[PDB]
C-alpha cells in the first residue's frame, strides 16, 4: 500500500555476475542495517565463474558495494591414503544468502567434491558448501555436511542408499532464532532431498581450514527412504522455520518438495527431529507447488500461517483451455493441536508465463494496522512481461484477495525482477518496514522504502 514507487534506491554489481540472485538484510553488532547480496556468477581469480558475495552499506543513492571476501582456491588434501578434492569452478557462491545475528551465511550449492583412492574414486559430484563470515571480526568458517569419503563401488553394492554425493547443500537456507543453520539439499539421497542442520556456534568452533572432512557432532541430517513417492522430489528446494506445534520450546521446519510424488509437489511441516507433522499436497502436477514457502502470522492471532507458491499453476479458462500463470496458497494455523485444513485463500496470477508465486516475502506490518502483510513476485508478469511484485495486506480473516499496491519492474526485459525478495526490516529507521527486490538478470537490487500511509 505505502511502499514508495517514485524514489527508489538501486545497487548494482558486475555485468553477468547475476548480482541479486539472493539477498537479505544484515544488522551489525550495533544494529546498523545493510544488504548482503549474492552474485553466483561473479568471476574469480582464474577468470572463471565462481560466484561472490557483496555487503552493501545503506545509502539512499545506492551504487557499488564492497565484496565480502571468501576463499576461492581449489583445495587438495592427501590423508588416510586418499586424496580429497574440492572444486569451486562454477560453484555458484551466493546462490543463497541469509543473515543471523552478526553472521552471514553464503552458500555455493554446486561446489564439486571428489575423493581418490588409487584407481577408484568417489565421483566428482556437487555436494555443495556454505561459507560463514563474521564481517566485523573477520572470522571465517565453512560447512559442507554432504562431503563423504566412500568410494563409488560401495554405493553401487548398497543400491545407492544414503548417497549424499549430489546434495547441493545450501540450495536453500534459513537460520532459527536460536542460531541453528538449516540447509536445504534437494539432491540428497539420489535426488530425494535432505535437510542438514547444525548450530552456527558449533560450525565455527569445529572448523579448521585444510581439513575438508571434519565432524560437526551437534549436526542433524534427515533420512533416506525407499518410498517412490519421494523419488526425484527435490525435498529441500525451499525451506523455512516457524511455530506450528504449540510448544514454543520447539522450532518446526517447513520444507518444500516441488516434484514430490511424480511432480505433484508437496510441502511438509516437521519438528527438529524430521518427524512429519503435516503434509500439504500440490493441486496440479508440474505446477511446482512448494517452489517457495513463507511463514508469517497474517491474521493477527499469534499463530504463524503458511504460504506456498506454485509459479507454474495453469488456471482453467473458457473453452477447456489452461493458462500457466502461477498460484499462491494461504494456510491459516488452527487454534491448538489440529491439522492445517484446506487453503484459506488462493491467489492466482494474471499474466501468461508470469510465474506469480515464484517468491513470497513476509513484509511485517507495512501499513501499521496490526496485521502482517506479504509481497508476491511475478518475475515475468505485468502487461509488458518485465516483472511485477504485488503486495497483499493481512486482515482478521487472512489476506485481502486483491493487491494493495503493484510494483512494476524499473529494469529492462529479462531482469527477472522479483526472483528474490526480502522484507520486514526497517533500513532507513523511519518506523516502517522496507522491501528489497533482486533482479539478477539486470545485476541489480532495488530498495523500496515504506512511507506514512496516504
Amino acid at each position, epitope marked *: 500500500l505505502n511502499l514508495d514507487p517514485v524514489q527508489l534506491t538501486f545497487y548494482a554489481g558486475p555485468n553477468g555476475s547475476q548480482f541479486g540472485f539472493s539477498l537479505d538484510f544484515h544488522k551489525d553488532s550495533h544494529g546498523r542495517v545493510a544488504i548482503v547480496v549474492g552474485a553466483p556468477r561473479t568471476l574469480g581469480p582464474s577468470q572463471e565463474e565462481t560466484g561472490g558475495v557483496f555487503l552493501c552499506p545503506w545509502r539512499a543513492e545506492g551504487g557499488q558495494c564492497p565484496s565480502l571476501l571468501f576463499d576461492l582456491r581449489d583445495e587438495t*588434501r*592427501n*590423508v*588416510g*591414503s586418499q586424496t580429497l578434492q574440492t572444486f569451486k569452478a562454477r560453484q555458484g557462491l551466493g546462490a543463497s544468502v541469509v543473515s543471523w545475528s552478526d553472521v552471514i551465511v553464503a552458500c555455493a550449492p554446486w561446489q564439486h567434491w571428489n575423493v581418490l583412492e588409487k584407481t577408484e574414486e568417489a565421483e566428482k559430484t556437487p555436494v555443495g558448501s556454505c561459507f560463514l563470515a563474521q564481517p566485523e571480526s573477520g572470522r571465517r568458517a565453512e560447512y559442507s555436511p554432504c562431503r563423504g*569419503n566412500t568410494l563409488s563401488r*560401495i554405493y553401487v553394492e548398497n543400491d545407492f542408499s544414503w548417497d549424499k554425493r549430489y546434495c547441493e547443500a545450501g540450495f536453500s537456507s534459513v537460520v532459527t532464532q536460536a542460531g541453528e543453520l538449516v540447509l536445504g539439499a534437494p539432491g540428497g539421497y539420489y535426488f530425494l532431498g535432505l535437510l542438514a542442520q547444525a548450530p552456527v556456534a558449533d560450525i565455527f568452533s*569445529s*572448523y*579448521r581450514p*585444510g*581439513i575438508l*572432512l*571434519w*565432524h560437526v*557432532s551437534s549436526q542433524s541430517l534427515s533420512f533416506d527412504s525407499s518410498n517412490p513417492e519421494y523419488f526425484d522430489g527435490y525435498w529441500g528446494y525451499s525451506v523455512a522455520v516457524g511455530e506450528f506445534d504449540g510448544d514454543l520450546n520447539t522450532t518446526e521446519y517447513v520444507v518444500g518438495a516441488p516434484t514430490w510424488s511424480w511432480t505433484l509437489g508437496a510441502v511438509e511441516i516437521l519438528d527438529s527431529y524430521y518427524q512429519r507433522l503435516h503434509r500439504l499436497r500440490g493441486e496440479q502436477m508440474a505446477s511446482y507447488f512448494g517452489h517457495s514457502v513463507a511463514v508469517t502470522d497474517v491474521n493477527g492471532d499469534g499463530r504463524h500461517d503458511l504460504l506456498v507458491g506454485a509459479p507454474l499453476y495453469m488456471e482453467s479458462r473458457a473453452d477447456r483451455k489452461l493458462a500457466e500463470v502461477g498460484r499462491v496458497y494461504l494456510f491459516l494455523q488452527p487454534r491448538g493441536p489440529h491439522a492445517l485444513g484446506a487453503p484459506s485463500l488462493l491467489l492466482t496470477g494474471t499474466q501468461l508465463y508470469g510465474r506469480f508465486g515464484s517468491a513470497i516475502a513476509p513484509l511485517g506490518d507495512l501499513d501499521r494496522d496490526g496485521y502482517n502483510d506479504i509481497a508476491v513476485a511475478a518475475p515475468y508478469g505485468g502487461p509488458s512481461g518485465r516483472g511485477q511484485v504485488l503486495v497483499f495486506l493481512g486482515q482478521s480473516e487472512g489476506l485481502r484477495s486483491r493487491p494493495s499496491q503493484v510494483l512494476d519492474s524499473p529494469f529492462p526485459t529479462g531482469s527477472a525482477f522479483g526472483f528474490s525478495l526480502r522484507g520486514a526490516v526497517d533500513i532507513d529507521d523511519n518506523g516502517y518496514p522496507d522491501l528489497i527486490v533482486g533482479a539478477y538478470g539486470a545485476n541489480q537490487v532495488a530498495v523500496y522504502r515504506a512511507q506514512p500511509v496516504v
Partner: antibody, heavy 119, light 108 residues
Framework: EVQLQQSGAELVKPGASVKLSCTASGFNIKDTYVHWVKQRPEQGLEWIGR????????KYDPKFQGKATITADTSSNTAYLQLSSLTSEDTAVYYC????????????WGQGTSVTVSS | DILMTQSPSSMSVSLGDTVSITCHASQGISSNIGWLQQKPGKSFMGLIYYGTNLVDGVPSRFSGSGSGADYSLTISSLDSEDFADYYC?????????FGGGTKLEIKR
C-alpha cells in the same frame, strides 16, 4: 562429554581368544571412526586397525591380519576387538581411539584394557 | 610404511623451561600429524591434530609446527603436570604409525 569406557583387564592362556569392548559415553559410536592401538614398553605403540560403526567396514595393518578382528554393534553403542591364537607377545595394553573433528585423527582415547597371556 | 623418528628419547628440564620435541617422517606427510600425552600410569590425551591445531581443552602453552617431513611440539613454560610421555603419530597413509616417544624428566 566424550568418554570411551573399555572393558576390564583380561588374564588368558596361550592359544585361546579374547574379545575386548569399547563402549561410547556421551555420544553415538556411529558418529566417527573407531581405532584400536596396541602399546608395549619395548615395542611402543602400534596401530591395529579401524572400523566405521555406521557400515562395519574395517581396515587393518597387515601385521595384525589374522589375530585382530574389529566389530561394532551400534545397538549397545560399543566397538569390539577380538584377538585369536594368543601369544606371550599379545601381552599388551589395548586402547580404542576416535577423532575430535578431523575425520582421520586420533584425539580421544579410552583408559586402556590390560591383557596378559600366560600358562 | 612411514617411519616416524621422534627425538629426543628423553630430556631433563625444569619448571618454566621452554622445550621442543621433534618428529621426522620417512616421507612428506603435509601436516597430517598429531601429538599425544600420556601422564605416568594413565591413559592418553590428545594435544595437537593436523600439525598445529590444539585439541579442545589443551592449554595454549602447547603449540605444534612444521611442514613436509619435519614437525615440532613446543611447550612454553613447563608446568609440574607436563612432565610425562609424548608421542607423535602420522595419518597421511594407512597404516597409521607412531613415534618412539619422549619422556620429560625433572632436572636436579
Amino acid at each position: 562429554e566424550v568418554q570411551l569406557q573399555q572393558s576390564g583387564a583380561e588374564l588368558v592362556k596361550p592359544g585361546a581368544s579374547v574379545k575386548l569392548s569399547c563402549t561410547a559415553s556421551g555420544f553415538n559410536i556411529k558418529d566417527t571412526y573407531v581405532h584400536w592401538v596396541k602399546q608395549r614398553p619395548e615395542q611402543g605403540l602400534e596401530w591395529i586397525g579401524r572400523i566405521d560403526p555406521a557400515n562395519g567396514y574395517t581396515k587393518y595393518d597387515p601385521k595384525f591380519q589374522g589375530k585382530a578382528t574389529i566389530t561394532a554393534d551400534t545397538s549397545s553403542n560399543t566397538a569390539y576387538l577380538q584377538l585369536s591364537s594368543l601369544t606371550s607377545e599379545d601381552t599388551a595394553v589395548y586402547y580404542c581411539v576416535r577423532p575430535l573433528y578431523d575425520y582421520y585423527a586420533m584425539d580421544y582415547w579410552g583408559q586402556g584394557t590390560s591383557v596378559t597371556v600366560s600358562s | 610404511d612411514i617411519l616416524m623418528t621422534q627425538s629426543p628419547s628423553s630430556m631433563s628440564v625444569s619448571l618454566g623451561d621452554t622445550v621442543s620435541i621433534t618428529c621426522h617422517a620417512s616421507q612428506g606427510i603435509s601436516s597430517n600429524i598429531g601429538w599425544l600425552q600420556q601422564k605416568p600410569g594413565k591413559s592418553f590425551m590428545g594435544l595437537i591434530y593436523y600439525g598445529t591445531n590444539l585439541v579442545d581443552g589443551v592449554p595454549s602453552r602447547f603449540s605444534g609446527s612444521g611442514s613436509g617431513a619435519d614437525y615440532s611440539l613446543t611447550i612454553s613454560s613447563l608446568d609440574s603436570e607436563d612432565f610425562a610421555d609424548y608421542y607423535c603419530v602420522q595419518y597421511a597413509q594407512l597404516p597409521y604409525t607412531f613415534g618412539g616417544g619422549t619422556k620429560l624428566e625433572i632436572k636436579r
